[PDB]
Amino acid sequence: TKYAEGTQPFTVLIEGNIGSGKTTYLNHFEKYKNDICLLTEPVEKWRNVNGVNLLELMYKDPKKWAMPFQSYVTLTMLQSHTAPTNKKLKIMERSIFSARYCFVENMRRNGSLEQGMYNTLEEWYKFIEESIHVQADLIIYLRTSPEVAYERIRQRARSEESCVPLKYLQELHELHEDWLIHQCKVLVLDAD
Amino acid sequence: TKYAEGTQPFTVLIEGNIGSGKTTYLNHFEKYKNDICLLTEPVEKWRNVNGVNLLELMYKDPKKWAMPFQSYVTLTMLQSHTAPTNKKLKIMERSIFSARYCFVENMRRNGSLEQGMYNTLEEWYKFIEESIHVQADLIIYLRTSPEVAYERIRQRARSEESCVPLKYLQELHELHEDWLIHQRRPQSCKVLVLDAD
Ligand SMILES: Cc1cn([C@H]2C[C@H](O)[C@@H](CO)O2)c(=O)[nH]c1=O
Numbered sequence: 001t002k003y004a005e006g007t008q009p010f011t012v013l014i015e016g017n018i019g020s021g022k023t024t025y026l027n028h029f030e031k032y033k034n035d036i037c038l039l040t041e042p043v044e045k046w047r048n049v050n051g052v053n054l055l056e057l058m059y060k061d062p063k064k065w066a067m068p069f070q071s072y073v074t075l076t077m078l079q080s081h082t083a084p085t086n087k088k089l090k091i092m093e094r095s096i097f098s099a100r101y102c103f104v105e106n107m108r109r110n111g112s113l114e115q116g117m118y119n120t121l122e123e124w125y126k127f128i129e130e131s132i133h134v135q136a137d138l139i140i141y142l143r144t145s146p147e148v149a150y151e152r153i154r155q156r157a158r159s160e161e162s163c164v165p166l167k168y169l170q171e172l173h174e175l176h177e178d179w180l181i182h183q184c185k186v187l188v189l190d191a192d
Numbered sequence: 193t194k195y196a197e198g199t200q201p202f203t204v205l206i207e208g209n210i211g212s213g214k215t216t217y218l219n220h221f222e223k224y225k226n227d228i229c230l231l232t233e234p235v236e237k238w239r240n241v242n243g244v245n246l247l248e249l250m251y252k253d254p255k256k257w258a259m260p261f262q263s264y265v266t267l268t269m270l271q272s273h274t275a276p277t278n279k280k281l282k283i284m285e286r287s288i289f290s291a292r293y294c295f296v297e298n299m300r301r302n303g304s305l306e307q308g309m310y311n312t313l314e315e316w317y318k319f320i321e322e323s324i325h326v327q328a329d330l331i332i333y334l335r336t337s338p339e340v341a342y343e344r345i346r347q348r349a350r351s352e353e354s355c356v357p358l359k360y361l362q363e364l365h366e367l368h369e370d371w372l373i374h375q376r377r378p379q380s381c382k383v384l385v386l387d388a389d
């Protein structure tokens with residue numbers, strides 16, 4: 001009896017690299033609140049963890065905060081994935097899968113997450129996928145280019161994620177590809 | 193609603209400070225495993241996490257390892273609390289409460305866990321209490337003075353915790369007291385208090 005069983009409608013997962021136009025995209029539903037369950041990335045919760053900004057800390061010193069920060073992202077992704085709703089359609093920005101398969105994995109490859117820290121996160125993920133139901137019917141992949149994405153970031157009045165190397169976006173891009181492209185229903189869209 | 197709700201039998205939690213004689217006490221229950229679910233503290237998992245020994249790392253470098261270590265402790269403890277069993281009684285050594293009210297709290301106070309790390313652990317504990325079901329019908333508290341606890345750890349083979357300052361056991365002791373005696377925490381069950389003597 002996985003927490004949040006028969007209480008989740010058709011769920012759409014909006015995926016994409018950093019600066020792939022996920023925010024602008026989901027805004028089209030901003031006027032469908034009255035009919036659909038629209039859940040944007042819990043970025044605000046990550047900026048206000050009872051006073052601490054884990055998002056800002058992780059970028060200013062990964063090797064020290066990637067672990068706690070990623071552990072919190074997971075929890076917020078879980079709360080959304082299992083949150084109760086009356087609507088018959090749920091649209092989520094990002095998900096527990098991308099945080100795991102892309103962001104955590106990336107941080108392991110580039111050294112931000114040491115062995116013990118990564119393992120701890122993986123153990124939590126394994127338990128979750130065995131004792132919790134994650135409704136993921138459709139996946140909307142906003143495929144982009146590391147370069148294009150890098151530009152869209154530099155353009156906006158960014159804050160925390162503004163100082164990210166192009167290489168970071170390249171490694172992230174590849175992970176999304178390996179997961180959403182090179183092996184459920186995934187609808188790729190040319191987000192350019 | 194709550195996960196594991198209605199699948200847990202009467203559950204007894206054994207609690208005490210480090211070196212309170214809990215491993216020895218629990219041994220006496222081994223000859224009853226036939227009708228009892230005896231879950232000892234998952235120390236084996238903390239020493240071997242896909243090859244890594246978090247317990248050792250935490251004790252050698254609190255500032256850096258307390259966070260990932262306590263996180264995994266929460267998890268393994270959550271696994272024990274919700275594990276399936278056909279027995280009519282379950283005895284667990286330590287719990288998700290002792291990890292929260294004693295161990296994590298003390299690591300926040302002495303600086304081992306920085307505010308952002310403490311809050312993350314706290315958030316998981318809050319989400320868990322709101323969802324996951326945690327059976328607790330009784331707690332057997334092996335009360336021991338820090339002096340006696342320290343002496344007991346001293347007379348045993350050298351482990352990772354063998355180095356804890358008396359001040360440390362003293363801090364954990366008051367935290368177990370505030371929880372199981374003064375009831376300053378919002379615990380969920382009766383408490384039977386035994387003496388080490
Ligand atoms: C989903 C997720 C986003 N992020 C980053 C990407 C951005 O800078 C921001 C939200 O888009 O946080 C992570 O660091 N880890 C994650 O698991």
Ligand SMILES: Cc1cn([C@H]2C[C@H](O)[C@@H](CO)O2)c(=O)[nH]c1=O
Pocket residue numbers: 210233235247262265286287290291292295296352353
């Ligand atoms: C349950 C728990 C035990 N421990 C320590 C006490 C011992 O050295 C060992 C198991 O009793 O691990 C913690 O540091 N934190 C915890 O949350």
